[PDB]
Amino acid sequence: MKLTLWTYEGPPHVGAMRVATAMKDLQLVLHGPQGDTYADLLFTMIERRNARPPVSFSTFEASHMGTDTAILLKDALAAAHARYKPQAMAVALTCTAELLQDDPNGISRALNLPVPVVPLELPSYSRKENYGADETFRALVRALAVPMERTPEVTCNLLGATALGFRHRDDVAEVTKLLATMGIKVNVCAPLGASPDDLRKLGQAHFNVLMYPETGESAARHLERACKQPFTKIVPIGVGATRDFLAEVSKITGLPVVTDESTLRQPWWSASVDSTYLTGKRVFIFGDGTHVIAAARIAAKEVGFEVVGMGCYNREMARPLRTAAAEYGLEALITDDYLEVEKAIEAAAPELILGTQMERNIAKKLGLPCAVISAPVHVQDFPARYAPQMGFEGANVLFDTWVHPLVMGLEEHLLTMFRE
Amino acid sequence: MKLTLWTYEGPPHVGAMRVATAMKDLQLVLHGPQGDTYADLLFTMIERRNARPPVSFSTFEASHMGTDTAILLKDALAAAHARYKPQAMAVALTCTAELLQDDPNGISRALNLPVPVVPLELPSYSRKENYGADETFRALVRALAVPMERTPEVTCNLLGATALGFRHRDDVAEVTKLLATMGIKVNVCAPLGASPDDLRKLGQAHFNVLMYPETGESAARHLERACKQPFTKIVPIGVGATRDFLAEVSKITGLPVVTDESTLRQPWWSASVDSTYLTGKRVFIFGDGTHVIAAARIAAKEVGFEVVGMGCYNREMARPLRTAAAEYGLEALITDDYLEVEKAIEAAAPELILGTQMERNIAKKLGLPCAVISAPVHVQDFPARYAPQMGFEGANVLFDTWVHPLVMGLEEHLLTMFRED
Amino acid sequence: TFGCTDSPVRRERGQKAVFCGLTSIVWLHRKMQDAFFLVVGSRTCAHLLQAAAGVMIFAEPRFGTAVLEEQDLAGLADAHKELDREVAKLLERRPDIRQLFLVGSCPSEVLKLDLDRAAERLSGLHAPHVRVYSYTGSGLDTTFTQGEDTCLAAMVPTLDTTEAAELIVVGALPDVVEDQCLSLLTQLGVGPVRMLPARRSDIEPAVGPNTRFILAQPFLGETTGALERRGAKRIAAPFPFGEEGTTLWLKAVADAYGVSAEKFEAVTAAPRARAKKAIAAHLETLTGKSLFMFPDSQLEIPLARFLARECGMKTTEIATPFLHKAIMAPDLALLPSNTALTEGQDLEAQLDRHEAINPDLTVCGLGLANPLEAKGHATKWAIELVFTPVHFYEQAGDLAGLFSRPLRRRALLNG
Amino acid sequence: TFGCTDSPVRRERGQKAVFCGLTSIVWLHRKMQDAFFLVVGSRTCAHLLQAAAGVMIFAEPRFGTAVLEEQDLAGLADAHKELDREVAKLLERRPDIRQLFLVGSCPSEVLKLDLDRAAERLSGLHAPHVRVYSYTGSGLDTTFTQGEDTCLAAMVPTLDTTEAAELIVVGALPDVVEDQCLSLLTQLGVGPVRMLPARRSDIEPAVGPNTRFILAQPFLGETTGALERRGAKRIAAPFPFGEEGTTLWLKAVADAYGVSAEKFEAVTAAPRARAKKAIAAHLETLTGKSLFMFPDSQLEIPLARFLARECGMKTTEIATPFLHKAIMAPDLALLPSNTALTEGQDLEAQLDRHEAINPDLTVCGLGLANPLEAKGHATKWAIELVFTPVHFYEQAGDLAGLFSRPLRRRALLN
């Protein structure tokens, strides 16, 4: 038992929803207690979604337990199908359903519907939200993707964009356009926007852009062996990272590297005399593996901060993060305890924090400038405006985002100084 | 004498620099003392510019007054021509040189340079920055534009974009997109980006888009008379205004409205249930005439705020503002006095204030939420990222910017109450 | 055309889009300054508490969960040893807490964890300073506000004995509302009155054969059972929403105490004029408009009564998670006799009914809200009604304001 | 190798990129709690204070500008009567003010308003509560820091008379620095010691034939003149930047006070040792780098002395708005002999000399800074040096830090 208040990640079945709601023409059926539908809030409220998530619960409760629970699952499945006629479905277990004997796969096949029902295995007590998204998506792909003829034109997939993803919407927009300036067209982008019938057409791409390891890696690895498709190892967040990413793509495809930089303004903003007080400002960086690794490079090598603490909440990125941290002379903090973070921050005594919504609150408690660099999504860090983290515009967005709280801090500090 | 601390606009000549710095291949020569070069720090620092402004001063000082001042202006005109061989030049007087007796016109005529030198009359003791810019661009256009054969394709001009403009860069960008969406291509864009030569080829556009009246109205009128080009009377800020701007262009061109709205999210953002608490929230709007008028429509008719005070610092824009404010049952506030503003804000008790860098400060002192909608501003509201205000992305930028200080407001107040009062 | 007493109520159960009892903790704890709520359950449950708490989560609230680890599933009590060092660790944080609730969840109930007995033991091991209770909050046996009920019911058995004739108002009312309530009931001459829950553990009410209690909230069946079990006797009243509701509520108490009509009308006149005038500000926009309520809180029936009789709203289908025959009878007698009543929910069925009625204003939770707005229906988010000041005279305007607003917004946004 | 006393100074004037004296108000007023600075000038003048003051403008500072109107241009009887009305108003709006400074601008002086007469006239009226002075800050006769000089020089004739033999340290310094100076001097046995200006109007120093003064800031020629005219004798010293400068500064004072060499080394030793450890931290990046300075304050020569001698920088061209030959003597005697000096500025010319030199670090104003970066030259904005604490031992490291930072950054981003 672990005494718990704040949680950076939800249960794995929420990650499942995250993949299902991302997609289209796919119903997900969770075997779970009445109540677990609270997770719809997340999608309809935070992401502003205009439709119910394609998720439904068997809804057992106290008066219909025992041998009824398996029956209620069969109905849940049956109904979802009759009502929505999706291209495919997925079935999984909530943590409460996990303590029962009901075989989703048994129940599932005995009903046999005219579409595939992919059973997912999400260990609710050892793993979390991110893995669940990853596993679900790998499971969907393993069940639907077949090897295919390559497309005439040089094309690629986009792997790992999901529902409650930090800036997935605009990241996908920005990455598409920077790939298209090299004449690389996108085949399917998944899960986000993809249907099960799109998962079947994955094979025909030349390679894959692995946008988010936390939600895409398993599926990327399957696609590598099953379709002889390489996948990009570099996540294009930061100017340095984007060039390296394009470089990587160039070597994967043999295409020359082309950029549009006419609107890239970060390098000059950071070079400009106006930035010199940024030099050596002590930054603490927390969030998920991917964004932390990316943030730290921009901080050190692009903005001229001194990276003074570095870590993440998701175990799955512990090693790439450890490798990254060493290059800065730091030992990676790996924890999901925000009280552990509150301590590592007090110790590191930074002048600015780049974290999640929680770090924002710790930052306020300590009276220090802060910017949000990764999920968990709150409604605010879900903009109506164009707000990518990736590629060249992304780099512009990040500069404004991070520097602003710094200037507001210096400015508040100065105002009160000359008031007497 | 008027006792002054904060000033909403600078002196007219600074407006002249806005036009000259907006352009390329034009030198502007200003007759003024040593030390007035401080303005250079506005374009270099805030606008983050990467070359010395194309502006030079005669630079007279106490040991070089008298007959020496008219020689020094002569030398500045000579020097700036020799060294930069610009296409055209401009000459004007600062506030101190306006007190002196030298003729900027006669001297330049008598130097007899191989390019045009436009003389500019700028009442430094009664007009401000905005007028200077409006007048300069007008003088130039008057000087350089001729009637011309219309373009084979339907094209237009973008009039008004200058240097220290609020979001001029990205507004130019965004308008070009939606015009291109309708199959209209921009001829020249002035001042921002043009050369004196570009200016010569203004006449051949089918019409003019008046992007910012305060710095373009004068020239658009000229180009109406002289080249029979109508100009647009609606600034596309906000969804509703953008739609009316598109309708306006259609009437002028005959082309049908075509929009790419695949990315326009404010309408649903504002409609969505997360926005309900926004209804009735009292808003106080100040700044440009143009930006205050545009803002008030978004506030009332798009976001669902009650507009509870409208004003601007900008006397040239006072009639269209008084007209607009009448519609909301409001007396317009025409003043350039921050203290007047601070009082009016105090009187109307707003829950959110939309204005200038000053109104931000008034707001902070009052501990009230706030967002910047209008010039002038310091470095921050000159962003590295795409941040238009015009058109559809403009509409999303605008939703984000106005609503976020409110949610941070509700948030701060909620958690001070939670722990525990 | 008023009276749904003999109206056939639809009993319905299938897919459900409602909250579990756990969510009660989010607002309940604020009221009980002295207490801490420890959910024994899943990361799912913590995830829920976090989602419902929103911004409160950063204000060191007096709740949290002990989340089950894989090693706790392995068929091995203790179990009771884990929970114990987990409790001692909490109470040491934390010496100020005086009441501790072990709140049961689906996972804690499916593993048959004996939290009742845990409360028993830990009270033994932490007396007299801290006292520890057990109640269920699971999706399995409880819906949203039903969690307040199961909480107070667990308390009732252990309240002090007394033979005093006193009034208890039951239901966690917001601090300002409670004050106004005490004031009004003082002014009528109603001798000692106590809230349950009380603001602090050490001023809880006593109960006995001569206690009277009146419910301030509809969702209090079990607390009512528990109070009745100790000899305390209920006063039936419609719930104090709006001017009519509040008067009927105060009146049932006046009558129970033999307060004169001369005195009732005197104490009650001005606060009533006040309230009635506040409500008319919204009548323009509200009148004649058809209403639909999805089940969330058990507050829907009385509020439907407030919107019909005092706001000139046309009623449609009004659903509630649970419909308690005796408690709700006063309010049912006042509901327009056209109203289709539902207890429970088959979500897909209920949505088909909804699209068919095409109602002007729909009360629902955030699972449904935006999806419905997208379909063209104005919606009012139900959950606000459980924590906003809404009861009694002074908040009657504010209450109607809550429903007029989404309809006013809808209008305002179409030029 | 190290003497410069004799090298020919280039004297130029043409196009300039420098601040006028009005700017001095921004950071002077902060020190002079009792005082309000009223500029009489254009909207241009108001605009410059607005720009130079940055966010200080929203902090109700104790300056402002009486911006001229059309009716004011002129003639003089009515221009003077209006100023009086505005001053009267401003004073009843803040009765906590005891000194008002009418600050002359370019527009005011071309218009020929005798702000001297106006100050004289207004002191008569507003006595005994308010003394009103007049000085020029105009672009016509002042560059940047010279406004402090004209201001302080205006105050001198009116300072109290005294026959005491007291020290006056001249030139506004940050309150933190002031205190350190005072402490070092007090524990060196030197007293009593007064600052000019003083934190408050009622605690200003008095002067007489027996007074001694020492400049803390290079730009104080007129004030020197004004104090000498009153009977005070100066103490020559290099300027207290760096461990060397601060020591020599202090040495000059202890000497003219009969302090033993013994007592000196004892008070000064710990702060000195600490000082040059803080400088070490910067030696790595600064040693061997070439330095170029456009003219802005008059700190350029002293600072180049500090950067060459203690930081190992190679000086190329050092420019200054004005070179007071006697005041700047000690510091010139310590500048590297290779140094090419310039008083004044011809901007286009100096920009060509610059490109030709290709120096590692260029000190310059914000109008020059960004365009110079864009051409691959590391720059340091000059103005910060007039408002950041940079004098004496405790600040020597920060001072060096002001010059390493920009080089560390150019490095750090490639």
Ligand code: SF4
């Ligand atoms: S429905 Fe059950 S498992 Fe889910 S959050 Fe509620 S108590 Fe926990």
Ligand code: SF4
């Ligand atoms: S005094 Fe002269 S240089 Fe200074 S702001 Fe006024 S006009 Fe410009």
